[PDB]
Structure 1
Amino acid sequence: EGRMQIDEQPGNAIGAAVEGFDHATASDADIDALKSTIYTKKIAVLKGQDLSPQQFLALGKRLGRPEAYYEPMYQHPEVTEIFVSSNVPENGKQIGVPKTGKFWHADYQFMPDPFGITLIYPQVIPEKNRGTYFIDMGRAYDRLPEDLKKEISGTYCRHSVRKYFKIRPHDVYRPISEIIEEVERKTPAVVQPTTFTHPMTGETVLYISEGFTVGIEDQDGKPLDEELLKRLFDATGQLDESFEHDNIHLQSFEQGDLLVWDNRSLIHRARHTTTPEPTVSYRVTVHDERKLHDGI
């Protein structure tokens, strides 16, 4: 230990690069500084990581408690805790699930107890169309018009996987209404405060995403017209299919990079499939020392 170096982007710019990180030997202070960087700079890019799937899980265990994805078709064949996004067949077989995350979302936002930290370890990186898009929803909250902050004050949002639940191999020949009903039973919509206070930073986070947030309700639980959600999606940059909105950050990476990011503050989205270049990434998702927000 005592060799890790963190290079934060200047000022309010998102992100930091982390050199000399070895998960097997990092000190307690090293991990504390890395976690502080994640919560403050939102994306930490670990450089020069050459890890097996088993070692990648070991690295995640240094940061928190891993949770495996609740649908197992996403899981790595050797490591249940690794979620695999892949469109490269292996021995002709589909590993993980292709073309995941083509919509704005925070990970597990449709679940009652979402984890605070997402780790992505790219395996196959497009030459041209690489990277992941991000919006910092605490910064996006701050940039809302004052009256729009007022309009969501005291409201609650409903989040559900019902739009982007992916058909599974064993769903073939089932009637679609059966699958729709099963999703509502297995993963019922969850209600969260529209905004919450980040336990680590104190920031107010606007916890919505176009992909999972399906309704908004007033302070008494009465459903509000979803045009409010559309206006919030619009203001925060989530309806811009050009990805030019000022809130949007394109995070690129190179071989050996490993992204660790704040899954309270950030929403993210895969790029458009503007090229046929494949993507393969391994994901570990960990709970840290606090719940997503104090109301959980």
Structure 2
Amino acid sequence: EGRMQIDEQPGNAIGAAVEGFDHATASDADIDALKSTIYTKKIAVLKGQDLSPQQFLALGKRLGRPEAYYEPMYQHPEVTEIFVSSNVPENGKQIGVPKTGKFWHADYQFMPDPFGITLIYPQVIPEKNRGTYFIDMGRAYDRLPEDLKKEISGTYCRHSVRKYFKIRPHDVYRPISEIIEEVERKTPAVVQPTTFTHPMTGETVLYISEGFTVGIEDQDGKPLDEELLKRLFDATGQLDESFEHDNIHLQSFEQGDLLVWDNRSLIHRARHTTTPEPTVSYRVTVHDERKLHDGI
């Protein structure tokens, strides 16, 4: 230590900038302070990062235990733990998967044991149409009308990858019903409390997303009409295709930036493909000292 400096946005404004961070030399106190910033400011942007794929993984390992993506076509060829979103061919070859995350979601929300921190290391940044949209679903919960808070009290939600599972090269010539069934076997829908208590901050988090949350059910386990989910999406800003909604944050980045964010509190999505500019990003996803919530 002696050089990492964290500049948190004032008050309730989301985000922080971190200058002079070196994952190879940061002290234990440095890491703890960076973690506190991630949990409270939700998005920390590390500046001046010039890392190999291996050094990026080592940075992630300072924050938690990396987990590799369960579908391997997403994995970096040299680092299994790096998830690659890319539509720029490397020597004419497809690396990772193109055009990922074009829907509101929290990462691994369709899995039974989601990780708490996401790291994104942009490699190729669109000049004009850059950035990722975010919603703080704890702040979004607090801003719901009281009666809507009451209506979801005690409910559970079902989360599934079934809408956005991407066809793989080895799926060609298979009947689609067989892939549909395989997805339900490998990644069955996961039931979670509709809201949970953030282990690091104590905030109530509304843990739903338009992309992965496929149903809501009552305290007795009986399915509820999906209009309730639609009203929740609407109220939290997830149905606003203009992205002007008050809850929505557009996070931009520049070369050398590295985004680290709270994957309990936030949902995110890619921008509309308004321009043909390409996107390449490397992702590391790490488990921290607590489960997503105490009920996991």
TM-score (norm 2): 1.00
Q: Check whether the contact 1:66–1:287 (CA below 8 A) recurs between aligned residues.
A: yes
* Corresponding residue SS for 1:185: helix
Q: Distance in 1 between matches of 2:81 and 2:265?
A: 23
1: CA distance, partners of 2:168 / 2:2: 46
Contact 1:113 1:292 (8 Å CA) reproduced:
yes
Q: Give the C-alpha shift of residue 2 in structure 1.
A: 1.5
**How far apart are the structure 2 equivalents of 1:41 and 1:63?**
16
Once the 2 structures are TM-superposed, how far is the Cα of residue 275 of structure 1 from its aligned partner?
Answer: 0.4
Which residue number corresponds to residue 283 of structure 1? 283
For residues 181 and 218 of structure 2, the distance between their equivalents in structure 1, rounded to whole angstroms, comes to: 26
Shift of 1:81: 0.1
CA distance in 1, matches of 2:94, 2:273: 19
Cα offset, 1:30, TM superposition: 0.1
Name the CA distance, whole Å, in 1 between partners of 2:224 and 2:238.
Answer: 20
1:70-124 Cα offsets, whole Å, 9 max, x none, are: 0000000000000000000001110000000000000000000000000000000
Q: Is the 8 A contact 1:136 1:267 kept in 2?
A: yes
Q: CA deviation at 1:176?
A: 0.3
Counterpart CA distance in 1 for 2:207 and 2:70 is: 21
Provide the rounded CA distance (Å) in 1 between the counterparts of 2:79 and 2:16: 28
Distance 1:56 1:188 in 2: 31
| Shift, 1:259, TM fit | 0.1
Tell me, in whole angstroms, the C-alpha distance in 2 between the residues paired with 1:199 and 1:2: 29
C-alpha distance after superposition, 1:234-265 (max 9, x if no partner): 00000000000000000000000000000000
Task: Check whether the contact 1:136–1:265 (CA below 8 A) recurs between aligned residues.
Answer: yes
2: CA distance, partners of 1:121 / 1:294: 29
For residues 139-150 of structure 1, what are the structure 2 equivalents within 5 Å? 139-150=139-150
| SS of equivalent to 2:181 | helix
Pairing of 1:1-296 with structure 2 (within 5 A): 1-296=1-296
How far apart, CA to CA, are the structure 2 residues paired with 1:171 and 1:272?
A: 27
Q: Is the partner of 2:77 in helix, strand or coil?
A: coil
- Provide the C-alpha distance between the structure 1 equivalents of 2:104 and 2:2, rounded to a whole number of angstroms: 38
Instruction: Measure, in 2, the Cα distance between the counterparts of 1:125 and 1:153.
Output: 41
Q: May I ask how many residue pairs the two structures share in their alignment?
A: 296
Task: Give the SS at the match of 2:54.
Answer: helix
SS of 2:211's partner is coil
| Separation (CA, whole Å) in 1 of partners of 2:163 and 2:224 | 20
Q: Which runs of 5+ in 1 are unaligned?
A: none
CA-to-aligned-CA distance 1:51-74 (integer Å, 9 cap, x gap): 000000000000000000000000
Report if the CA contact (8 A) 1:2-1:30 is conserved: no
Residues 37, 44 of structure 1: 8 Å contact kept: yes
Secondary structure, aligned partner of 1:103: coil
Q: Give, in whole Å, the separation in 1 of the partners of 2:255 and 2:27.
A: 25
Deviations 1:184-224 (A, max 9, x none): 00000000000000000000000000000000000000000
Contact 1:198–1:293 (Cα < 8 Å) also in 2: yes
Cα deviation, 1:104-163, whole Å, max 9, x if unaligned, reads 000000000000000000000010000000000000000000000000000000000000
CA distance in 2, matches of 1:279, 1:168: 20
Which whole-Å CA distance do the structure 1 matches of 2:26 and 2:163 have between them? 41
Note the alpha carbon deviations across 1:9-43, whole angstroms, 9 max, x for none. 01000000000000000000000000000000000
Give yes or no for contact 1:76–1:82 (8 Å, CA) kept in 2.
yes
Q: Secondary structure at the match of 2:37?
A: helix
Distance in 1, matches of 2:202 and 2:148, equals 20
Percent of aligned pairs with the same residue? 100
Aligned CA-pair RMSD: 0.3
Helix, strand or coil at the partner of 2:260 = strand
- 3-state SS in 1 of match to 2:215: strand
User: Per-residue CA shift, 1:269-290, capped at 9, x if unaligned?
Assistant: 0000000110100000000000
What residue ranges of structure 2 are gaps of 5+ in the alignment? none
CA distance in 2, matches of 1:95, 1:248: 30
2: CA distance, partners of 1:270 / 1:27: 34
**4+ residue stretches of structure 1 with deviation over 3 A?**
none
